[PDB]
């Protein structure tokens, strides 16, 4: 690593200095058939060979700590093959000036190779960049319950990584969401809610119309006196729908608490009180109804 | 920052002046083995080293105020690694002329690298640009209730940022909408409405046809005398549908007010008056009906 | 292979040395009509011919071990034709400097050829790159049961390859999933679950309201004493819905075990106990209900 | 073909040698108004004319064996027109150096022409490349029954081609699937299945609860003694659902055989045994049920 | 056309020869203020003017046979305007060397113009290329009945063109399908079917179980003796489904013929025989059934 | 326009001739501090200023006939601003050689500007190109009734334009269809139909099976003797479906006429005859049926 790199740099600097001194001597004294370009190319090739050997040393070392944690020899050998071919291709690209062919044909080849690699690896790059963005600006935090109206990502955030985010679903299963999704969908954060909402519909029989009015008032009064209902939020109780078999009354309010169990307990208490109020005034709930004409 | 930049610029200007003076002297007096290109390259390398050291100083400082607010050492160290590799890659690109390799191979490499970075980071850039556009021209304002027929973004706008917009839903939950969505979907603004609309259907029995006409007139007359109904807007009451089990009469009007509770109260009053009118004329509402042929 | 490559390299090095010596001699002694560029072009053409012959030897050998495992002669011959035309096209591109035509027209031709090959082969490249990514970072492992809310990939992972992943479905059928899908969809891993979830709904008759309260308590008490229920997880039993023909009570709990058969046995035991509790208090489950008005 | 190509190459080599000899003579003896560039351009034009004539000969011959198999004269003539215009366009591109116009304007024209041809013919190229990939790595084989959860490609594979794959559907109709689809969808291979699956649901009346337990045991015992059921696979019989009008018992097992007729026969035998077991214990299957409240 | 082109070429060749002779004379004798580049530019401009006049002659002629078949003067005049502006733009691009401006700015302008024309006209080019592909390799033929599971293209093929394919629907209406669709969808060819398929379901009452077995045998025996049923294909008759109100028996076979009327006649005969067999054994078909619990 | 262009060209030609004469004089006689490049740049700048003034004159004139037809001053002024900035940007691009900056930086700037304009204006260009294609090859004509199975474009074609096509719907409303849609969807042309189709289903009671056969024959005979039915087309009457509550008989035929009213009259006559035939044989049509099991 740094030691080998420093050694290679020192060797290269020394070889370059020696070549420059040799060129200066060939300038001073009879150079004969010299071609200083050829001497410089040989010097570069020596540097190129040293760099290639150093790189292959790291390739072998990398293969070693790849195998020692598993990664059976087939897969590790294949991966080493891939990245050594990548290294040699990069080396061929970089120095086509010293001894390589037409610079312009190499331009075309390297350009279209990099360009196809450009389209191919777009998704991984987008995931990495969205991970960086989430590092700098994220709408949630670890432990927050989140959901989206576009995709199914519901659950509590467990970990945030460079490529994927780990979320614990509500059936105790891990879910791995690619980071790029957080750059194009709307993310809702119920974990930062302020109140829980109670919404329901009371369906009365069509023969209870004369009672509807007073019933509404009764329900509203109860909601104004319940100790678990937030009085500074919206509180609506009105008759607003002609259903097929019933007259519908909306109920719309909020609870002071955000805890799941307390909200459910308050909802159950409100529902039981509503049943008592409706049955006290002589009305009743309506089943689906029909009119039958027999032959 | 500005102080370090000024110091580096002064040092660079002085080194360049010294190199120019040395080149002029080598022109005047015997230059010997000079290679003024080499002296200039050494001078640039010194400037390059100074710039690299200055940049790394800022990298370290940035890492420091990243850690002091949290951002555990692993993540901060990784981020510093990323941006220092980015800086060194930029430096390698910029000065491949002084000592770098083939300018044209470096062209290919830098070009395809920037081009893949181009496809990868399109979403973040689009969000930033749409944020700028919303800064200059936005259809809503903070506190406005908005919705869209294409996506689910309903709620009152809370904050407008550079990347995302924060909207408060109607169950008191925050929602984070990417800015780019506001460049391709239709945004409706109910917060700037002028009237609320009352629409309903009266379904009468098929044996009430002889009454339908007069009933319609009655309803229309009531809507023309209600103090909560805007008389300068549309007001339609007509029989316009043969339903499966009923004859349907449309009711279509507007209220003067836009407040939620007042609109609901007016709607309830209108519905109760409609029930009274229908039952006063001897007609009745129709349940779903069927004809049964028994064996 | 390596032997033939070494022989060709040695031959090329020797030919180049001979050509350089000949050019030096033509410099020293009367060169006559020489055109050293032409001699070098002839030398390169000889090297080009040798390289082409060597490549065609490998093409033929490859065709041989393609046929010996099957791959009837038509298909193998066609494939050899394709890759030999590819090789000759590459050779024509590389050395258009020595005797080829306008370097710039060849630039255009090679560039647009590589660019169309770029769009065409994007999917295979993306699959290969996602295979590499799965090699380095994968959310699952061999033998894990996985599923996705976006696509149908449910089953237990059997093999992970360079292009596709083999998954065993639950009807004992192999399924081959392209690797690129794992870069854009959310992958859920039920094989790493911690608990199994029991969720159900108890629908009581509308005449059982006076009992609902006590019934809920009874059920909750039973769930607090069942030896197969995890007491450190969520445990909710509340009345929370006015259904069309019934009052709905939710039941929400977790089991200690994750085995399929044990979870099903515990679920059956809980259901039977629930039936006994409901029938013991005088209530009953509700069928779909209706009200009929006869003529 | 090869003979004409060899003749043209020999003629071109001879013309080039003659032109070089003429240039050498013009160098030696008084060249007068020579412009050796013009002589070389004339020589190339002669070579260009010979190449064009040779190409047109092949164009005509190709038209001939196109017509002799049909392909009425209109279509064949049109196709010959297309590929001869393509050939002349290629010739104009290649040698704009000898007498053509600005090399750079020709760069622009050839580049954008090839680039539009690049977008236009992407689908055919992708089909060809996916055909090559299927040649090297395919998940199925000829005669295998395959299907996909993404598209409708169900049937037994009949032929694999360079562009499309021919599949025989189960109503004895050919289906032609483009090869590129096999690079982006999940392919399931029921032809390589190991067992067939038997899954069903037993719906009992709500008054049969006291029997449910014993009934389940009976069914399970039968499945443990059936000679056609694989005992090493999954075998589940549990009561796991409160349906609207019934209590549901799941049955989940596998058969030893994979043949269609034998699997169906075993399924029928199991179903008849299940009916006998259910009716023997005094229970019965449940029709959809309802509760009617008459006026 | 060819005559005018030959005349223009002869004139251009003569002008070029005259200019070359004039340049040679100016070389031999005192050229004075000559600027041979200017004389050559004037000569080219004369050639350019001649070419422009010749092109405009064809533009006018084309307008003439456009109008003589209709194409009212407005549309024809507009089209002539478009293609003459295209011709002059091409001429401006081609010779910006002789007197045009910066070659590199013209590079940028021509390049981005051609590139936008590249994205814009992709669909027409794709249709043309798919037409060529269909010419070389098509899955159907004129007169074949085809359909697709992806799009609605059902009908018998009538004509195959360069851009669209004309198909006669089964209500005697023409349908024009773009050719590019045949490069990305699966095409099924019922016109090349081998057998027609008979599939049906027999739903028996739940009280007919004791008969089900024998009934199945009877039906199978009949299908084995029907002279219109192919005995070498699949023939399956089994009880395989517990329906809501019935027990379902599958029937699955093939006919020897592929003619529409004969297949329908055989199907009707089979259905009538099935009815007779079912009613002969004492069973009966099942209507939808329900259980009613009255108050 | 042409007059101003001719005047400007004459002025430019004269200025260029004067500059050339001045350069020749400076060559002949003592030029002193001349810098002929500077004199030529001044001459070009004068030409540039004249061209800019001429262009601005047309800009103003265009603004004038824009306002005189309406187009209130704000919009017209804005549009003039846009196209004058476009003109000046084009002028800056074209002549960066005479006095502009680095040609290569201007290359980058002009290239990316044109390239973004390339992506942005793709839709308008595609509409224009599809309009040209429809001019040359269109599947319909003015007055034809067309429809598509992919989009809703049903109606009779009224006008064909360069960007959009105007179609009259069947409720007498104009519809404007972008031209590009006609390049990617299947267009059906009912206006060029040859026959109208009569298709229906006769549902008989399950107790009418003994009659089904003869009934079918009767219906077929009637269809063979109806004077409004085309006897050379398809004519099918068969029993082909076991429905839930009925036995289904298909009727499939064609009428000789294509007029709407005559086709409807023939259909009504056929339906009445079918009713008479069915009721004459003792059968009857079937209502939806059910079997009820009372407690």
Swiss-Prot record, chains A, B, C, D, E, F:
Record text on subunit structure and interactions: Homoheptamer.
Similarity remark: Belongs to the MscS (TC 1.A.23) family.
Name of the gene encoding the protein in the UniProt record: ynaI
Single GO MF annotation: mechanosensitive monoatomic ion channel activity
Alphabetical UniProt keywords: Cell inner membrane, Cell membrane, Ion channel, Ion transport, Membrane, Transmembrane, Transmembrane helix, Transport
Domain of life: Bacteria
Organism classification: Bacteria, Pseudomonadati, Pseudomonadota, Gammaproteobacteria, Enterobacterales
UniProt-listed Pfam families: MS_channel_1st, MS_channel_2nd, MS_channel_3rd
A GO cellular component entry from the record: plasma membrane
Protein known as: Low conductance mechanosensitive channel YnaI
Location of this chain's protein in the cell: Cell inner membrane
């Amino acid at each position: 690593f740094l030691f080998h790199a420093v050694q290679f740099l020192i060797y290269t600097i020394i070889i370059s200095a020696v070549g420059s001194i040799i060129n200066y001597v060939i300038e001073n004294y009879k150079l004969k058939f010299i071609t200083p370009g050829v001497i410089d190319f040989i010097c570069t090739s020596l540097i190129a060979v040293i760099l290639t050997i150093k790189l292959f040393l790291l390739i072998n070392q990398f293969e070693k700590q790849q195998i020692k944690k598993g990664r059976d020899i087939t897969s590790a050998r294949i991966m080493s093959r891939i990245i050594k071919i990548t290294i040699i291709v990069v080396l061929v690209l970089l120095y086509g000036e010293h001894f390589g062919m037409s610079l312009s044909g190499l331009l075309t080849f390297g350009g279209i190779g990099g360009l196809v690699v450009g389209m191919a690896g777009k998704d991984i790059l987008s995931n990495f960049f969205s991970g960086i963005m989430l590092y700098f600006d994220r709408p949630f935090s670890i432990g927050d319950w989140i959901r989206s109206p576009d995709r199914n990502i519901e659950g509590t955030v467990a970990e945030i990584g460079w490529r994927i985010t780990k979320i614990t679903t509500f059936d105790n299963r891990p879910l791995y969401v690619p980071n790029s999704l957080f750059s194009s969908i709307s993310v809702e954060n119920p974990g930062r809610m302020t109140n829980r909402r109670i919404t329901t519909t009371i369906g009365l029989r069509y023969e209870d119309a004369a009672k509807v009015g007073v019933i509404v008032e009764a329900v509203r009064e109860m909601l104004k006196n319940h100790p678990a209902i937030d009085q500074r939020q919206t509180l609506l109780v009105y008759f607003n729908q002609f259903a097929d078999s019933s007259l519908n009354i909306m109920v719309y309010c909020f609870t002071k608490t955000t805890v799941w169990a307390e909200w459910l307990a308050a909802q159950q208490d409100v529902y039981l009180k509503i049943i008592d109020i409706v049955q006290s005034h002589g009305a009743d709930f309506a089943f689906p109804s029909q009119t039958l004409y027999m032959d």
